[PDB]
Amino acid sequence: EIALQFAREAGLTRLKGETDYVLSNVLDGLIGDGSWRAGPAYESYLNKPGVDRVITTVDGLHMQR
Amino acid sequence: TTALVCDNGSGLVKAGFAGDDAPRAVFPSIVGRPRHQGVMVGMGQKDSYVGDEAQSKRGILTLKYPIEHGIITNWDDMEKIWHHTFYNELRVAPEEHPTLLTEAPLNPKANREKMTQIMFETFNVPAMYVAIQAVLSLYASGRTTGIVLDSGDGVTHNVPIYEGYALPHAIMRLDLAGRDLTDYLMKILTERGYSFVTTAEREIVRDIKEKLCYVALDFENEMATAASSSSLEKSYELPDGQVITIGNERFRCPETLFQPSFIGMESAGIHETTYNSIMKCDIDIRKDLYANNVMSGGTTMYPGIADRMQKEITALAPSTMKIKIIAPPERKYSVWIGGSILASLSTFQQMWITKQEYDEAGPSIVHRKCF
Amino acid sequence: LMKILTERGYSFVTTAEREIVRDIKEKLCYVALDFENEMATAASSSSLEKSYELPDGQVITIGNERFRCPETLFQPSFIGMESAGIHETTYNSIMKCDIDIRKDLYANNVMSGGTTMYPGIADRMQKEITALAPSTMKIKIIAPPERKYSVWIGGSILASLSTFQQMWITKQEYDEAGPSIVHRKCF
Amino acid sequence: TTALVCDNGSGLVKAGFAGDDAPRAVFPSIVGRPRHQGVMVGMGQKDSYVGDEAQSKRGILTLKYPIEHGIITNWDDMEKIWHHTFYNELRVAPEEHPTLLTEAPLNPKANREKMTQIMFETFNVPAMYVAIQAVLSLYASGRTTGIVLDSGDGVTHNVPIYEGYALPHAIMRLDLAGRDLTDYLMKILTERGYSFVTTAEREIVRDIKEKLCYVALDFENEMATAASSSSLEKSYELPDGQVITIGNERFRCPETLFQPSFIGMESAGIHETTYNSIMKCDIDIRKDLYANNVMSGGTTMYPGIADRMQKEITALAPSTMKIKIIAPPERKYSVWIGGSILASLSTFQQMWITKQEYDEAGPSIVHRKCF
Ligand SMILES: Nc1ncnc2c1ncn2[C@@H]1O[C@H](COP(=O)(O)OP(=O)(O)O)[C@@H](O)[C@H]1O
Ligand SMILES: Nc1ncnc2c1ncn2[C@@H]1O[C@H](COP(=O)(O)OP(=O)(O)O)[C@@H](O)[C@H]1O
Ligand SMILES: Nc1ncnc2c1ncn2[C@@H]1O[C@H](COP(=O)(O)OP(=O)(O)O)[C@@H](O)[C@H]1O
Numbered sequence: 003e004i005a006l007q008f009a010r011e012a013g014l015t016r017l018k019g020e021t022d023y024v025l026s027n028v029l030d031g032l033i034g035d036g037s038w039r040a041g042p043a044y045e046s047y048l049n050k051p052g053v054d055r056v057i058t059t060v061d062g063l064h065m066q067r
Numbered sequence: 068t069t070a071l072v073c074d075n076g077s078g079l080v081k082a083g084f085a086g087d088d089a090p091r092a093v094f095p096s097i098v099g100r101p102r103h104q105g106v107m108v109g110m111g112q113k114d115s116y117v118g119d120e121a122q123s124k125r126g127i128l129t130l131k132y133p134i135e136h137g138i139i140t141n142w143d144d145m146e147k148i149w150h151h152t153f154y155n156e157l158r159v160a161p162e163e164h165p166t167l168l169t170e171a172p173l174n175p176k177a178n179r180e181k182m183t184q185i186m187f188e189t190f191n192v193p194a195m196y197v198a199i200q201a202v203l204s205l206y207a208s209g210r211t212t213g214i215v216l217d218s219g220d221g222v223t224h225n226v227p228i229y230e231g232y233a234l235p236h237a238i239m240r241l242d243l244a245g246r247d248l249t250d251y252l253m254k255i256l257t258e259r260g261y262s263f264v265t266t267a268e269r270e271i272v273r274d275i276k277e278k279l280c281y282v283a284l285d286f287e288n289e290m291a292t293a294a295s296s297s298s299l300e301k302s303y304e305l306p307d308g309q310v311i312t313i314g315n316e317r318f319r320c321p322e323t324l325f326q327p328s329f330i331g332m333e334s335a336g337i338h339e340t341t342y343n344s345i346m347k348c349d350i351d352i353r354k355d356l357y358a359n360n361v362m363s364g365g366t367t368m369y370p371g372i373a374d375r376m377q378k379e380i381t382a383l384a385p386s387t388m389k390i391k392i393i394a395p396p397e398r399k400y401s402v403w404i405g406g407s408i409l410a411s412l413s414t415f416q417q418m419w420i421t422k423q424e425y426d427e428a429g430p431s432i433v434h435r436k437c438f
Numbered sequence: 439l440m441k442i443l444t445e446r447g448y449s450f451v452t453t454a455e456r457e458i459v460r461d462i463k464e465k466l467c468y469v470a471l472d473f474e475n476e477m478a479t480a481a482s483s484s485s486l487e488k489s490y491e492l493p494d495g496q497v498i499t500i501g502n503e504r505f506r507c508p509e510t511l512f513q514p515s516f517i518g519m520e521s522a523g524i525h526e527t528t529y530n531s532i533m534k535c536d537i538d539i540r541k542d543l544y545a546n547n548v549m550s551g552g553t554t555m556y557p558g559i560a561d562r563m564q565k566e567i568t569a570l571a572p573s574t575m576k577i578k579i580i581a582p583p584e585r586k587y588s589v590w591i592g593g594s595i596l597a598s599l600s601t602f603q604q605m606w607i608t609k610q611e612y613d614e615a616g617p618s619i620v621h622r623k624c625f
Numbered sequence: 626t627t628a629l630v631c632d633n634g635s636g637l638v639k640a641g642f643a644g645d646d647a648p649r650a651v652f653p654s655i656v657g658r659p660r661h662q663g664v665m666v667g668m669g670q671k672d673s674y675v676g677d678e679a680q681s682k683r684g685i686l687t688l689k690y691p692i693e694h695g696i697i698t699n700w701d702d703m704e705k706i707w708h709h710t711f712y713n714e715l716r717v718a719p720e721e722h723p724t725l726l727t728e729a730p731l732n733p734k735a736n737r738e739k740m741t742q743i744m745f746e747t748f749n750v751p752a753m754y755v756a757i758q759a760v761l762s763l764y765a766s767g768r769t770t771g772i773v774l775d776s777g778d779g780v781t782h783n784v785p786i787y788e789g790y791a792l793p794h795a796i797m798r799l800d801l802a803g804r805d806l807t808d809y810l811m812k813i814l815t816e817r818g819y820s821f822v823t824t825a826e827r828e829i830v831r832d833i834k835e836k837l838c839y840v841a842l843d844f845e846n847e848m849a850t851a852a853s854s855s856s857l858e859k860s861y862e863l864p865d866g867q868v869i870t871i872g873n874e875r876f877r878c879p880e881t882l883f884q885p886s887f888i889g890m891e892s893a894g895i896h897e898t899t900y901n902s903i904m905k906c907d908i909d910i911r912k913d914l915y916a917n918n919v920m921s922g923g924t925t926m927y928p929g930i931a932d933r934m935q936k937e938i939t940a941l942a943p944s945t946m947k948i949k950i951i952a953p954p955e956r957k958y959s960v961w962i963g964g965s966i967l968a969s970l971s972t973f974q975q976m977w978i979t980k981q982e983y984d985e986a987g988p989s990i991v992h993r994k995c996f
């Protein structure tokens with residue numbers, strides 16, 4: 003779990019396959035499936051399937067059209 | 068005469084009669100005052116609103132919590148709260164009932180001193196008593212050995228008890244509870260364009276957290292899944308008809324309990340706090356304390372929290388020990404149930420703080436006849 | 439309406455003619471539910487046209503001016519103003535209040551005054567606000583028949599409530615504070 | 626190659642080359658369209674006027690602000706403004722120069738995503754980076770420790786930094802800024818009979834607010850002076866030759882910054898927000914934060930606002946601490962100067978987000994290499 007926490011937050015698995023080969027065996031020893039080379043999956047807010055423009059209390063004092 | 072049990076928690080107030088199975092009145096511990104200037108004469112407006120009444124009209128009020136991190140900051144508001152609890156929900160006369168109270172461990176002593184003074188002067192109660200919430204929680208579950216993790220709205224504390232003997236030096240306290248989770252969710256919700264800033268909108272975020280949050284068994288595994296598809300997404304309807312949709316915010320908000328560093332606190336997660344508290348007891352009672360974890364309080368109602376706690380403790384404890392986490396379905400009211408049980412025991416009737424005693428000793432008597 | 443009746447050769451330029459045109463507007467105009475749809479019908483046939491008798495015996499007939507005149511309430515662009523329509527003004531007026539009272543304010547649209555008396559204006563208001571409002575919310579328009587005198591009736595009520603006789607302004611108070619007292623005592 | 630810094634604020638857009646002392650181009654962020662009919666043929670009237678040409682001809686246009694409360698709302702209008710900034714105001718090709726963009730803290734994450742995508746697809750910039758405006762304000766001050774209060778046209782926010790270490794949990798954001806003050810001044814000017822309702826007449830109110838308003842040291846004493854005599858009354862000449870005179874409105878309009886309840890907002894004034902943001906930090910850095918208050922933004926240029934800030938904070942902080950407010954004369958352009966410094970540092974050349982790095986991870990990359 004600690005290795006995955008560094009990967010997602012800091013970026014330990016940025017190279018995602020061309021690491022120093024010292025960090026490789028340590029990760030390979032921790033998780034043997036070898037799935038860390040894929041990279042940490044990230045959520046993209048560009049698409050917005052559930053985009054919900056919401057006028058709350060503050061946003062309702064100042065708008066256009 | 069009939070005894071009264073009043074659990075004045077940070078978020079909600081539980082009240083009722085001793086010997087009952089459930090509290091009779093449960094209302095939020097909020098006092099609201101108008102923020103706009105009135106224009107229509109004849110209806111009449113009160114200067115303040117208390118409890119459910121302040122919740123209904125929250126669109127024109129500012130709601131102030133009289134209790135913060137378990138310590139009563141505003142005393143006039145708490146006086147009004149007790150007035151309400153005594154005359155508009157239970158419909159009782161305080162002078163004719165012995166009332167019981169609860170207090171979080173390791174709190175300032177001025178808090179309980181003022182509580183005792185207020186109840187013996189403003190309301191003239193014939194008898195009173197202040198108990199530690201964890202002890203009542205242990206009474207409610209019908210056990211005399213185990214470690215209690217009571218996590219309410221303001222305070223999350225651990226109190227290990229063995230064979231009716233507590234170990235005060237092992238008691239932990241952490242000011243990380245439901246209100247901080249609500250604040251963290253209010254901060255995180257801005258990542259999706261939803262902005263809640265007003266005190267009325269704080270309550271809405273609280274309802275969202277109550278109805279849509281859960282604790283993930285594997286945090287990194289859960290985050291990956293929500294980033295891969297839209298399975299975990301759910302939509303909530305705002306009071307004005309608009310709809311919002313929250314994704315990984317569902318399990319990020321409660322994760323502050325296990326990773327306090329999200330909100331800038333240096334303390335350890337509640338699992339590590341429980342382990343540290345167990346490890347500070349004697350070596351001969353750790354086997355029993357491992358196998359009698361009792362959770363109670365509102366913050367322990369997130370679905371799946373029991374499994375995550377069991378997994379973390381097992382990861383911390385030695386292999387040969389057996390870890391059992393006890394989560395009764397009525398744990399939200401465990402403190403009040405325990406208080407009702409304690410007030411109905413015959414042996415306890417000799418432990419009340421009578422008015423006579425208070426008069427002779429003074430508000431200082433709360434530090435002797437109470438733990 | 440004065441500027442638009444010139445399109446049929448009718449000219450009104452003096453104040454008495456102003457009152458006459460105002461009377462025509464009171465007696466013949468109405469608010470069309472779909473301005474674009476109603477404009478097609480008027481240009482297609484002559485069912486919408488009516489007749490009015492001028493004070494000196496001449497007879498005038500007006501067509502699409504019946505519902506183009508009151509449309510300026512919804513599209514102030516007709517008289518050159520940049521401001522938005524009354525429906526969108528009401529919508530904005532609600533979005534500037536606190537989120538917990540929007541539900542109640544949708545369900546209590548009260549309308550009053552003579553300009554509100556046009557036939558069908560309540561239905562057009564309801565349709566426009568429903569178009570602007572969220573789908574779940576219920577839009578209800580309250581249009582009492584005597585709304586031409588709602589302000590006076592409310593004044594009559596407020597001047598007769600017992601709890602009001604302490605909110606007066608008296609000459610003795612006037613002499614001490616001067617004309618500035620009105621902002622301090624009244625809203 | 627030379628870098629560009631583009632501080633696309635809510636009210637004005639600042640642009641220039643890195644290493645330069647002042648922005649080369651400053652123009653209002655307005656996109657305008659005609660609201661009449663063009664009866665003269667042969668002029669070939671265009672569709673949209675952007676920038677100064679919109680202000681000059683505003684008598685026949687409707688003016689629309691694409692950025693509001695620091696959040697871009699009309700992306701086509703923003704695209705037009707960026708196109709104008711790159712081509713007609715700087716006379717440079719965006720495809721050959723690195724660019725730096727600024728953003729307010731606590732914005733929705735989708736806001737910077739679309740900025741990154743537009744820069745990397747429509748303009749094909751070689752590299753780009755997004756920084757928080759508050760941090761860049763500290764770079765221009767030549768300081769590495771202090772709390773910044775940035776207040777522009779849309780957003781007023783606080784960011785505490787100690788020894789180059791930011792504390793995200795103490796960041797404050799308040800949507801109360803210059804546009805709100807202009808609207809409140811419009812609403813108050815109807816008391817003297819002056820009426821302003823069109824967008825073109827909004828800009829005149831902005832000009833009179835800039836040229837006549839000042840922050841009062843003591844509000845109540847200032848009101849009495851205004852009502853007693855005519856000393857504070859000043860005259861302004863409208864563009865048509867008509868003259869207006871305003872009285873206490875000179876210092877009532879900026880008072881909203883300290884009393885948000887004037888415009889119906891519930892949050893506290895800027896002074897209390899600044900004090901609260903410091904008090905959320907560790908107690909061992911509060912002395913430096915009191916000693917290094919830095920202010921920036923247009924809404925800070927009111928005469929005598931720094932003295933009011935000092936008086937207000939010193940009344941809240943303990944008596945032993947020293948409050949030093951820093952208000953450099955060029956603080957209206959602090960953010961751009963800080964950006965120009967940052968893009969010019971050799972050690973910053975490795976923090977750019979390149980096109981080769983963009984496509985690899987998609988627009989999501991902006992949430993990792995930036996803050
Ligand atoms: N089903 C639920 N899911 C998540 N949180 C809950 C749920 N029910 C209650 N809570 C939380 O519990 C808190 C109050 O519970 P409680 O322990 O009664 O507080 P207190 O002990 O102060 O009275 C609330 O702040 C709420 O956030
Ligand atoms: N039946 C009607 N249909 C349409 N318009 C009307 C009608 N009656 C009155 N009006 C309009 O209402 C306007 C003023 O009415 P009223 O509500 O008395 O104004 P005020 O509120 O200023 O007293 C008049 O100019 C007239 O054009
Ligand atoms: N001398 C001044 N006095 C008062 N207000 C000013 C002055 N100069 C600029 N402003 C205000 O500053 C606001 C925008 O300034 P600026 O900080 O550049 O905004 P942004 O940071 O969004 O570019 C304008 O709305 C204007 O009202």
Ligand SMILES: [Mg+2]
Pocket residue numbers: 074075076077200219364402
């Ligand atoms: Mg409790």
Ligand SMILES: [Mg+2]
Pocket residue numbers: 632633634635758777922960
């Ligand atoms: Mg700016």
